[PDB]
Amino acid sequence: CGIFAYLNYHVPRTRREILETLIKGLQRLEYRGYDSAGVGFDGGNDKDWEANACKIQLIKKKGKVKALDEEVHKQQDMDLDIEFDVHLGIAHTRWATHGEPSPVNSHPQRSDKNNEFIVIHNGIITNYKDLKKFLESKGYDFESETDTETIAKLVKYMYDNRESQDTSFTTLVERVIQQLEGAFALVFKSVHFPGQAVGTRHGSPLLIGVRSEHKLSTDHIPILYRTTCLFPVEEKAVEYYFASDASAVIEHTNRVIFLEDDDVAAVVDGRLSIHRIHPGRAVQTLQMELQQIMKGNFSSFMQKEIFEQPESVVNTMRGRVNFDDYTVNLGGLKDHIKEIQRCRRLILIACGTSYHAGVATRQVLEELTELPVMVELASDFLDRNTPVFRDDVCFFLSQSGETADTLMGLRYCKERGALTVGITNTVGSSISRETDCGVHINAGPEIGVASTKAYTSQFVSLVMFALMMCDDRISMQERRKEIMLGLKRLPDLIKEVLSMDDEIQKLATELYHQKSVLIMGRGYHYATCLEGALKIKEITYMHSEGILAGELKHGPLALVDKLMPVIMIIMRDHTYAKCQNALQQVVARQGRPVVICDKEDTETIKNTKRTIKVPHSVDCLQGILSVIPLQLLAFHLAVLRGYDVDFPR
Amino acid sequence: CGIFAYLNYHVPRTRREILETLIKGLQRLEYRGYDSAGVGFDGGNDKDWEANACKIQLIKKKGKVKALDEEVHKQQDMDLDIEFDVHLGIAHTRWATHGEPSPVNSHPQRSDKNNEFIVIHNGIITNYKDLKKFLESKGYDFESETDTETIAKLVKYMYDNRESQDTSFTTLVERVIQQLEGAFALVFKSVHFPGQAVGTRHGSPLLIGVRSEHKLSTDHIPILYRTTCLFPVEEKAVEYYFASDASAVIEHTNRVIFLEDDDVAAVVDGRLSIHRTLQMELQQIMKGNFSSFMQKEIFEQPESVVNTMRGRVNFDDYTVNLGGLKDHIKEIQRCRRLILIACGTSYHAGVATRQVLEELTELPVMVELASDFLDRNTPVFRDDVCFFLSQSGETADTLMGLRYCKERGALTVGITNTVGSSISRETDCGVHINAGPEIGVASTKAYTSQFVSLVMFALMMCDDRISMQERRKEIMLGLKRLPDLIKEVLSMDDEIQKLATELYHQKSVLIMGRGYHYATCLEGALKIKEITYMHSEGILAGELKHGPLALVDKLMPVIMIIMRDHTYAKCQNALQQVVARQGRPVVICDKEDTETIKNTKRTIKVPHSVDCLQGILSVIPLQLLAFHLAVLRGYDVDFPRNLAKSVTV
Ligand SMILES: O=C[C@H](O)[C@@H](O)[C@H](O)[C@H](O)COP(=O)(O)O
Ligand SMILES: O=C[C@H](O)[C@@H](O)[C@H](O)[C@H](O)COP(=O)(O)O
Ligand SMILES: N[C@@H](CCC(=O)O)C(=O)O
Domain contains A647: no
Stretch 538-567 of chain A: residues touching chain B, C-beta under 8 Å: 538-539, 541-543, 545, 548-551, 553-561, 564
CATH of the domain at A148: 3.60.20.10
Q: Which long-range contacts (CB under 8 A, 24 or more apart) does B570-576 make?
A: B570/A379, B570/A383, B570/B514, B570/B541, B570/B542, B571/B513, B571/B514, B571/B541, B572/B596, B574/B512, B574/B514, B574/B541, B574/B542, B574/B544, B575/B600
My answer on whether A514 and A493 are in the same domain is no
Interface of A with B in 620-649 (CB under 8 A): 649
Cβ-in-10-Å burial (0-12, 13-18, 19+) of B498 comes to exposed
Q: Are residues B498 and B387 in the same domain?
A: no
Does B47 contact A at CB distance below 8 Å?
no
For residue A382, report the phi and psi dihedrals to the nearest 5 degrees: -80, -35
User: Taking CB atoms and an 8 Å limit, are B551 and A558 in contact across chains?
Assistant: no
Q: Tell me which amino acid residue B31 is.
A: Y
Please indicate, yes or no, whether residues A217 and A250 belong to a single structural domain of this protein.
Answer: yes
Among all ligands shown, which has an atom nearest to the Cα of A151?
3
Question: Domain check: are A367 and A421 in the same one?
Answer: yes
E-strand stretches of B394-515: 411-416, 429-432, 508-513
Residue A286: what residue type?
Answer: L
The DSSP bridge partners found for residue B368 are B341
Amino acid at A505: Q
Ligand 1 pocket test, candidate residues A306, A451, A647, most atoms within 8 A of CB: A451
Alpha carbons B523 and B80: distance in angstroms, whole number: 48
Tell me if B553 sits within 8 A of B584, measured CB to CB: no
Among the residues of B491-613, which ranges form H helices? 493-501, 518-532, 568-580, 594-599
User: Which residues make Cβ contacts (< 8 Å) with residue B53, sequence separation at least 6?
Assistant: B42, B86, B87, B191, B194, B195
Residue A295 CA: distances (Å) to CA of A3, A495, A630, A631: 22, 19, 21, 18
Q: Which of B477, B514, B518 is nearest to B610 (CA)?
A: B477
Residues B431 and B518 in one domain: no
> Among the three residues B235, B261, B282, which one is the final residue of a domain in this structure?
B282
In this structure, the residues whose C-beta lies within 6 A of any atom of ligand 2 are A 554-555; B 343-346, 390-392, 395, 398, 442-443, 526, 530, 646-647
For an interface test with B, which of A519, A554, A622 has the most B Cβ atoms less than 10 Å from its Cβ? Answer: A554
- A412-417 long-range contacts (CB < 8 A, ≥24 apart) are A412/A381, A412/A382, A412/A388, A413/A347, A413/A349, A413/A388, A416/A388, A416/A389, A416/A390, A416/A392, A417/A389, A417/A390
Q: Which residues in B lie closer than 8 A to residue A534 (C-beta atoms)?
A: 547-548
Residue B511: closest CA among B555, B445, B556: B556
Please check whether residues B37 and B184 belong to one and the same domain. Answer: yes
Q: How far apart (Å, rounded) are the C-alpha atoms in residues A415 and A433?
A: 16
Contact A119, A41 (CB under 8 A): no
Return the amino acid letter for A192: H
Q: Going by C-beta distance under 8 Å and a sequence separation of 6 or more, which residues neighbour residue A231?
A: A216, A217, A238, A270, A271, A272
| CA neighbor of A39 nearest in space, from A70, A11, A9, A14 | A70
As beta bridge partners, residue A9 has A86, A238
Q: Give the span between the Cα atoms of A116 and B34, in whole angstroms.
A: 82
B614-632 vs B493-501: helix crossing angle, rounded to 10: 50
Q: In sequence order, what are the residues at sequence separation of 6 or more whose Cβ sits closer than 8 angstroms to the Cβ of residue B445?
A: B297, B298, B300, B301, B304, B435, B436, B438
Single-letter amino acid, residue A331: G
DSSP A502: H
Q: Looking at residue B228, what DSSP letter applies?
A: -
Stated as kind and residue range, the H or E segment containing B333 is helix B329-333
Same domain? For B304 and B196 the reply is: no
Out of B394, B431, B443, mutate this one to test ligand 2's pocket (max ligand atoms within 8 Å of CB): namely B443
Verify that A98 and A228 share a domain, yes or no. yes
CB contact (8 A) between residue B529 and residue A363: no
**A231 domain-assigned:** yes
CATH at B581 = 3.40.50.10490
Q: What is the CA radius of gyration of chain B?
A: 27
Taking CB atoms and an 8 Å cut-off, how many pairs form between chains A and B?
163
Final resolution, Å = 2.8
Report the C-alpha gap between A563 and B612 in whole angstroms.
40
Residues B477 and B569 in one domain: no
Residue A645 falls inside a structural domain:
no
* Integer CA distances (angstroms), B350 to A362, B386, B389, in order: 20, 12, 8
Distance, CA of A83 to CA of A95 (rounded, Å): 33
Spatial distance between the Cα atoms of B101 and B72, rounded to a whole number of angstroms? 18
Residue A19 inside a domain? The answer is yes
- Whether the CA torsion A143, A149, A154, A156 is positive or negative: it is negative
Q: How far apart are CA A277 and CA B461, in angstroms?
A: 49
Write B312-317 long-range contacts (CB < 8 A, 24+).
B312/B456, B313/B456, B313/B476, B313/B479, B315/B476, B315/B477, B315/B479, B315/B480
Question: Which residues are registered as beta bridge partners of A392?
Answer: A345
Distances (CA, A) of A39 to A13, A44, B156: 17, 15, 93
Secondary element (H or E) of residue A376: strand A373-377
DSSP one-letter string for B136-201: HHHT-----SSSSHHHHHHHHHHHSS-SSTT--HHHHHHHHHTT--EEEEEEEEESSSTT-EEEEE
The DSSP bridge partners found for residue A393 are: A346, A419
B220 and chain A: CB distance < 8 Å anywhere? no
**A549 interaction partners in chain B (CB closer than 8 Å):** 371
Which amino acid is it at B366?
M
- In terms of Cβ atoms closer than 10 Å to its own Cβ (0-12, 13-18, 19+), residue A337 is middle
Chain A hits for B370, Cβ within 8 Å = 550
Query: Exposed/middle/buried for B319, CB within 10 Å: 0-12, 13-18, 19+?
Result: middle
Q: How far is CA A583 from the centre of its chain?
A: 39
Contacts of B507 in chain A (CB under 8 A): 515-516, 543
Asked if residue A250 and residue A391 are part of one domain, the reply reads: no
DSSP state of A250: T
Last residue of some domain: A266, A290, A314? A290
- Domain end: A497, A517, A544, which one? A497
What string of DSSP letters covers B404-419?
HHHHTT-EEEEEESST
Q: By C-alpha distance, which of A93, A28, A31 is closest to A288?
A: A28
Nearest to A621 by CA among A530, A432, A490: A490
Nearest CA in chain A to B346: A554
Separation CA A374–CA B366 (nearest Å): 7
A451 touches chain B (CB under 8 A): no
A109 is in an annotated binding site: no
E strand spans, B323-469: 337-342, 365-369, 384-390, 411-416, 429-432
Q: Which amino acid is at B268?
A: V
Residues 6+ apart with CB under 8 A from B243: B2, B3, B4, B5, B25, B29, B206, B207, B208, B209, B249
Residue A263 lies in a domain: yes
Q: Decide if B642 and A557 are in contact by the 8 Å CB cutoff.
A: yes
Nearest by Cα to B642 from A570, A607, A566, A515:
A566
B429 catalytic per annotation: no
The answer to whether the CB atoms of B363 and A558 lie below 8 A apart is no
The total number of structural domains in chain A stands at: 3
Residues in chain B whose C lies over 2.5 Å from the next residue's N (breaks after): 226, 276
Domain interval for residue B467: 287-489
Question: Sheet of A611-614: strands edge to edge?
Answer: A543-548, A516-521, A566-570, A594-598, A611-614
d(CA B61, CA B39): 9
Q: Which atom of ligand 2 is nearest to the CA of B392?
A: 16
Please, which residues bridge with residue B14 across strands? B83
In angstroms, the Cα distances linking A82 to A77, B111, B343 are 13, 103, 74
CA B241 – CA B170 distance, rounded (Å): 18
**What are the Cα distances from residue B528, in Å, to A314, A516, B152, B273, B633?**
45, 15, 41, 48, 12
Residues A440, A345: one domain?
yes
Task: Assess whether A264 and A315 both reside in one domain.
Answer: no
Instruction: Pick the closest to residue B388 from B358, B433, B355 (CA basis).
Output: B433
Spell out where chain A is interrupted, by the residue before each break (C to N > 2.5 A). 226, 277
Q: Which residues have C-beta within 8 Å of that of residue B470, sequence separation ≥ 6?
A: none
Taking the CA atoms of A572, A577, A583 and A584 in sequence, report the sign of the dihedral they define. Answer: positive
Strands B264-268 and A182-190: unpaired
Q: How far is B261 from A113, CA to CA, in rounded Å?
A: 92
DSSP A31-71: GG--SEEEEEEE----SSGGGGTT-EEEEEEES-HHHHHHH
